[PDB]
Structures are given as C-alpha cells and as structure tokens.
Amino acid sequence: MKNFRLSEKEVKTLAKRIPTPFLVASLDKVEENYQFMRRHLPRAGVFYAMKANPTPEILSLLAGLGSHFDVASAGEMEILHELGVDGSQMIYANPVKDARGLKAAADYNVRRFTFDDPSEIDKMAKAVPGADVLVRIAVRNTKFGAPVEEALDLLKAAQDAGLHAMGICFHVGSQSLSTAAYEEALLVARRLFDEAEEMGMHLTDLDIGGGFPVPDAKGLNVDLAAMMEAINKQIDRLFPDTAVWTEPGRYMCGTAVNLVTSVIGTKTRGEQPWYILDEGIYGCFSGIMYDHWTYPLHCFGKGNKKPSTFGGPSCDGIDVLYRDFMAPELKIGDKVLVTEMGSYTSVSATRFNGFYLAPTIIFEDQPEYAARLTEDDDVKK
Amino acid sequence: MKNFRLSEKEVKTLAKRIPTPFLVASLDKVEENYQFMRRHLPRAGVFYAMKANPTPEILSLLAGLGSHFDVASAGEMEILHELGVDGSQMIYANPVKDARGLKAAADYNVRRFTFDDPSEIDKMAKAVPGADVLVRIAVRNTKFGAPVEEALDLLKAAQDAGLHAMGICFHVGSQSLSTAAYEEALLVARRLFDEAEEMGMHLTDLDIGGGFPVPDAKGLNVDLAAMMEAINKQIDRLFPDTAVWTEPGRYMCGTAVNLVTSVIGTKTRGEQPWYILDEGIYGCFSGIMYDHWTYPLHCFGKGNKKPSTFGGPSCDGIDVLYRDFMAPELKIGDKVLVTEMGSYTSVSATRFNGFYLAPTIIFEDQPEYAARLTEDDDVKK
Ligand SMILES: Cc1ncc(COP(=O)(O)O)c(C=O)c1O
Ligand SMILES: Cc1ncc(COP(=O)(O)O)c(C=O)c1O
Ligand SMILES: [Mg+2]
Ligand SMILES: [Mg+2]
Ligand code: NA
Ligand code: NA
Ligand code: NA
Ligand code: NA
C-alpha cells in the first residue's frame, strides 16, 4: 500500500548526477501493483493499457509477469514488437483504426479488436479476415461506445462479414471512485450475454476496462483491495462461464514514478512569491490540461509556509502550475519532488520552446536503491 | 496577401504518395511574410521567435534572408547551431534561464539576453560576464515582465554586476488586433529611455516583441500593411536614435502551412454525424488547448452541409475538435484540409497513444509546386 517516494536525501544524490528535470520510475512498484491486482481480482486477465506509460523497461517487466497489452496504434504495437511481445498478447482496443494500425495488426498477427460502429466492420474484415472482435457499449458514470440496443446488431453484422463475435467491452471512465458503475455495467453486459445465447450467438469474453483510481494531490478516498474484491465477487456471481479481462492504465504505473525538478527562478514581487520550475505544462505537467489532474508537490523547506505560485520554464503565459500553494521559502537550485507522476504525464510531454523531454531513470539500476536494499537487509530478518 | 492553400487536386495527388496525417509548408510564403515585414516595418530588425515553428528548412531560409533568431532554450540554440547560425545572430529571450541554457549561450557565444527579475542577474553575470541585457517590462492589452518602476533599478543592478545594460523589451501579447498597445508600450519605453539618459545610463536597443496577428477560422479583421506602417511611423516619431527589433513568431509561418488529414471513422448515430480524423488534439490540434485557437477546416463536399462533430484518433474523450460544424457528408478515406496551421501546432504535438508526429513536407520540393510553376510561367508574362 505504499506509494513510491524518494526521500529528500535520495533527491540530493540523484540530482548531483542527473540534471533536472528527470523522472524516476520504480519497477518494484510496477510489479507490486500488478501482483496486487492479480491477488484481489484473480478472475480478471490484464491488458496493460500502455497509453498511460509506455516505458520499455516497464513493458518488458509486465510482459515477463504474463500481462497482456492493450494497444491503440501502430506505434504501440511496434514498440511491443521490438521487446519480443507477440501479436497474440495484444488487443487493438482503439474502437476506430487507421490504415497503418490495421497493417501492423495484420503484420504482427494481432487477432483481437474492439469496435463501436458499423463503419468499422469492413475495415477490420478486409484487414484481418478471421478475427475476434468485442463490441464496445456505452455505460454510465459520448465519443466512444455503441448504444446498448445496437450492440447485438453490431455483433451479428460483424459475423455476416466473417469476423468472430467474441464478446462485449466497456469503460466506466478514468479515475473511478465507486464500484457501482463497474457492477451496473457488469449487469448491462449480463443481459446482452443472455439475449445473445438465445439468439444463436455464444459470447466467450468480457472486457471491463480500466478506471481504477490513483492518489492525487488530495490523496485517495477509496480502499482498492475491497473495491477489487467486490468487483471480483460480482464477476463470480454474474460470470461463472466467462473469460473476463481488465485494462488498467493509470493504476499500473501512476504511483510508481516521481518527478524531480529544480527551482530556476524566483519572483518575490509580493504579495505572493512565484517559483519558476524547470518542468512545465508543456512537459510532464501537461496532465493539468488533458487529464484535469492535480499532482502532489513536495518542497523540502524548514521555514513556515506561505501561499505561493508555481510556473514552468516556458515563455507562454499559460505555463502556470499551482496557485495559492502553501510553500516554504525556496531559492534557485532547490529541488522539489512530485509524486504519483507515472500516468498521462510524460506521454503528453512536448519539446515546446526546444526543451528536451524529461528522461525516465530506472530506480532499481541506481545506488540509492542499493542503499535502500542494504538498509532493508539489516533491519528486517 | 494570399494564404498558402492547397487546391483539392493537390490534396489528392499528395495523399496518393504520403500517408495522412501530414503537414505541408511553403518556403515561398515564409519568404513572402518575411519580406512583407521588412517592407512595411523597415525600422525593425527581425528576431524570428522560433518557438512558433522550428522546421529546419524554415530556419535555414530565414537565416539566409538575414533574419536573427530569438531562442528560448538550449535545444533551440542547438538546432540553430547545426544549421551554421552563430550565437551573434541570437537573443536568449526567455526571461528565466536554466543551467543547460546558460551553458549553451556560453558555448555558442550568445551575447544578448532578456530578463525581468533581480534573481536572474547573477545567473547571467557568472555565465556570460560581459553581456548585453534588455529588461523586459510588463505592458497592457502576469508571469513575465518587471513592473515599469523596477525597470531602471534592474538595469543599474545589472551594470553593478558587470553586464552591459543595452535596453528595454516588451510583448503586447499574442494575436494582437489593434496597434494601440504597440504605441502605448512604445511611449512607456520612451519615458524610461529619457529617465535613463539623464541617469547617466545610455540605452541603445528597443525590442517591441511579437503579437502580429494571423487569420483564424473566422479570418482576419486587421490590415497588416497599415498596422505595420503605423507602428513603423510611431517608431520613427519616437525613436530616431534607437536600434529597434521585433520578435514575430506566429506571423512568420502561420499562413504558410496546411494540415492534410483523412477521415478514418464515421458515427452516423444522429442527430449529428461524428467524423473521426487521423490528426487530433494530442497532435497538431493541440493549439485548441494551449493557444485557445480555432483553425479553418475545409471538407471538399458536393452535398448540402449539416451540423457535424469532428474528433481525433485517440482513446481519450477530450479528443474532440469541432462541434456543430457545417459539413457535407464525408466517408472514410476522404481528405479534409486545415489551413493557417504553421504556428503553435506541431510544436505542441505528442506521441500520445503511440501515434507518430505528423511530418512537415516542403511544398517546393514537390511536383505539385512544379505544376504550379508551369501553370504560372504560361499564363503570366
Ligand atoms: C480501452 C481503454 N482501456 C483502458 C484505458 C485506461 O484507463 P485508465 O487509465 O483510466 O485506467 C483507456 C484510456 O483511456 C482505454 O481507451
Ligand atoms: C519573447 C517572445 N517574443 C515573441 C513571441 C512570439 O509571439 P507571437 O507568436 O504571438 O508573435 C514569444 C512567445 O510567446 C516570446 O516569448
Ligand atoms: Mg514536440
Ligand atoms: Mg510524447
Ligand atoms: Na527481445
Ligand atoms: Na506521497
Ligand atoms: Na551548415
Ligand atoms: Na483559407
């Protein structure tokens, strides 16, 4: 249940060697998150929604743990391919596919697809003649998902075009707090499954999507073990027959990555001090824009705190990260730490203003980790 | 006064060879924009604010026309450096600088800097001991610019630290419609310049920044030749003595680039049809988010039009580009054209969902341009 968190001392030593900004990712935490899911939701096979974090070391580890991968483009398939993951470990789960992506699915023998529209059926059919498809249905909690009444018709239309109608999928939405939606959506899919059998169509797989929460600036309301055991139980209650899958994205790596950034300018105009950092809204803090997210920031200061503004290194007036944030006095060259940074962060970073992408350093390859290990082998036994 | 615009026929031929999405940039239009500025604002030397569009061919052409470059990071300096632009053609105009950027300015002999804070003075002083600095003042039309009363004190403090106090700069804000702000800001700087001379400080350079407008979805209200001649005149009226500079960004390349994107999915659910394109809010249409911008889209349809929704290829529900847009019926594989796409577009694109960055094709290297040239040499003489 710990979030991966560098101590102040670890930030000092790392920053002596590696110029800021940089990200630090713990493979151990990614392993722990995966195993925790497998323990509390044993009925659900895992399609890592790699769109959240595609770091190759992270992908190699999950592949090694037996995870499967949800891929949304040619590029996601391509990077998996260079790590020796085969198309049989993938689902092309973008409901609307481009030419490049259909080619790649064909070339790497990807054989599972999701879809939510009639227009999609011929693209898939031509590209991958015999192919398992799941229909995506729109559940409650716009752009994606077929209305629940179209669902059986879309699967039948898919069989008439020579594709194998394998099942149903859905996604409750990202950062879900309550299990209700998961259980509502499981019922909605239950109805459809019955209606299908009697219709002379036998559906074998259910994909319940992602949405498992991660802690943000205010932390986490939910207990995840319960949440997962609950939904696991109501899977058992409803789908004894059926092969069920989940597509975690945010959950897998969100609590496994920290950002380390230096203060590079101060603006003590008053009333409120502005601290300018070396990572900004055009880099890792892009999730403020695209993910409506608020990240936990840690300032390492002795003095009393005061309302402070943080901004990014760019020349754009939009590059403001925090306002009215209670912070001690910082000076140029101080490090701040941002935790819970592994998801929908570096995947939307840019080279706006010519800045370099912040690199991801694998913590387990560093002496700070060796130091944690020697500290742990002494105290625990 | 023409915007660069591919005909329907040009889109067909290009799309036969180059898979969508891709961007098409006309060097001739970039030349025409530069020369137009030099003609109507002859008093202002040009620091191309490359943050808007850093395409190397575009930079090589401007360098060749004698433009200078406004650079905001190490990476912007680095790419200029590989094109053989020397540090003497650059201004490091980011008011708050990182370590990498000060190193690079030192290594490439960049000798002009802007700043707006006291904390910045020692960074600059250590890094580039003898160095021209301009103080940035905050004008009217938050994050950047010193209050007008601090300005002379910041320049004096900069001289006490061994830097050469060269002048003042400002920026009215992006996409300016009226010349007032330019002329207000020119007066504010005039006062400061007088106050400085009598203070035993002689200021040699004025930098009036950017903000010259580009046409958007609704077009352009302003006449640019007038706007520029006006501001040129009021420079002549106010600054006979002084070396003046401008920092166009958006203006230089905005009207010189088109995006070509294919329709890859349809959603005729009703009432409104959704057209899913292969370029999205995580790519070129990122300016919708970071630049509050609305781009002109051209659908090439015979049939009557109807309110339509456009979205992007990603799996995120935020990836919606237009709503209620009057469009003819499109089918999968149609091309749409987006004009006025050269600024603050590809510079904020990402590889979210593993999509590839849309590439920039130089129009003048293509047979479509040869075809335009043979058509023009016949008709005109
Ligand atoms: C099909 C699918 N599954 C899972 C996810 C990831 O969901 P989350 O990151 O909220 O768990 C996405 C991305 O939004 C997706 O498109
Ligand atoms: C110093 C400076 N000049 C010019 C510009 C570009 O202005 P615009 O693109 O609105 O002309 C910028 C970027 O916002 C900048 O920071
Ligand atoms: Mg980029
Ligand atoms: Mg990226
Ligand atoms: Na391998
Ligand atoms: Na924490
Ligand atoms: Na060269
Ligand atoms: Na036009």
Query: Domains plus CATH for chain B?
Result: 1-28+253-381 (2.40.37.10), 29-252 (3.20.20.10)
CA separation for the pair B80, B69 (Å, rounded): 8
CB A207 within 8 A of CB A114: yes
Backbone angles phi, psi at A285, to 5 degrees: -75, 10
Resolution of this entry, Å: 2.5
Q: Taking each helix axis as running N to C, give the angle between helix B56-64 and helix B74-82, from 0 to 180 degrees, rounded to the nearest 10.
A: 70
Facing B73 at nearest CB: one of A262, A266, A354: A354
A74 touches B at CB < 8 Å: yes
Burial A244-262 (b: 16+ CB within 10 A, else e): bbbbbbbbbbbbbbbbbbb
CB A176 within 8 A of CB A141: yes
Sorted by sequence, the CB contacts under 8 Å of residue B278 that are 6+ apart come out as A98, B20, B21, B261, B262, B264, B313
Ligand that comes closest to the CA of residue B79? 7
Q: Which of residues 207-246 of B touch A (CB under 8 A)?
A: none
CA separation for the pair B137, B333 (Å, rounded): 51
A79 neighbourhood in chain B, CB within 8 Å: 354
CA separation for the pair A4, A28 (Å, rounded): 9
Backbone angles phi, psi at A182, to 5 degrees: -60, -40
B143 neighbourhood in chain A, CB within 8 Å: 274, 311, 317, 319-320
Residue whose token pair is 């202002």: B44
Are the beta carbons of A144 and B73 separated by less than 8 Å? Answer: no
A121 touches B at CB < 8 Å: no
Q: How far apart are the first and last CA of chain B?
A: 21
The beta strands (E) that lie in A94-242 are given as 112-115, 132-136, 164-169, 205-207
The beta strands (E) that lie in A36-170 are given as 44-49, 68-71, 90-92, 112-115, 132-136, 164-169
Radius of gyration (Cα) for chain B, nearest Å?
23
B351 neighbourhood in chain A, CB within 8 Å: 75, 347
Q: How many CB pairs under 8 A join A and B?
A: 162
Backbone angles phi, psi at A152, to 5 degrees: -70, -40
Q: How far apart are the first and last CA of chain A?
A: 21
Q: State yes or no: is A315 an active-site residue.
A: yes
Give the technique used to solve this structure.
X-ray
A16 touches B at CB < 8 Å: no
CB B172 within 8 A of CB B139: yes
Phi-psi region of B365 (alpha: psi -120 to 50; beta: other; left: phi over 0): alpha
Which residues are bridge partners to A136 per DSSP?
Answer: A169
CA separation for the pair A247, A50 (Å, rounded): 9
CB A37 within 8 A of CB A289: no
B264 neighbourhood in chain A, CB within 8 Å: 96-99
Least CA distance to B146: which residue of chain A?
A269
Under DSSP, is residue A65 helix (H, G, I), strand (E, B) or coil? coil
Token duo for residue A187:
């019922």
DSSP code string of B304-352: PPEEEEEE-SSS-TT-EEEEEEEE----TT-EEEE-S--SSSGGG---G
- Using CB atoms within 10 Å of the CB of residue B198, give its burial: 0 to 12 exposed, 13 to 18 middle, 19+ buried: exposed
Are the beta carbons of B19 and A100 separated by less than 8 Å? Answer: yes
Token duo for residue B191:
């006062």
CA separation for the pair B216, B255 (Å, rounded): 10
Name the amino acid, one letter, at B33: N
- In this structure, the strands spanning B257-267 and B68-71 are unpaired
CA separation for the pair A2, B165 (Å, rounded): 53
Residue whose token pair is 């075809």: B371
Residues having CB within 6 Å of any atom of ligand 2: A 315-316; B 49, 51-52, 70, 93, 171, 174, 209-212, 247-251
Q: Which of B119, B62, B116 is nearest to B89 (CA)?
A: B62
Q: Distance between alpha carbon B307 and the CA centroid of its chain, in Å?
A: 32
DSSP code string of B142-161: --S-B-TTTHHHHHHHHHHT
Facing B76 at nearest CB: one of A262, A311, A354: A354
Are the beta carbons of A75 and B289 separated by less than 8 Å? Answer: no
Q: Which ligand 2 atom is the nearest neighbour of the CA of B344?
A: 9
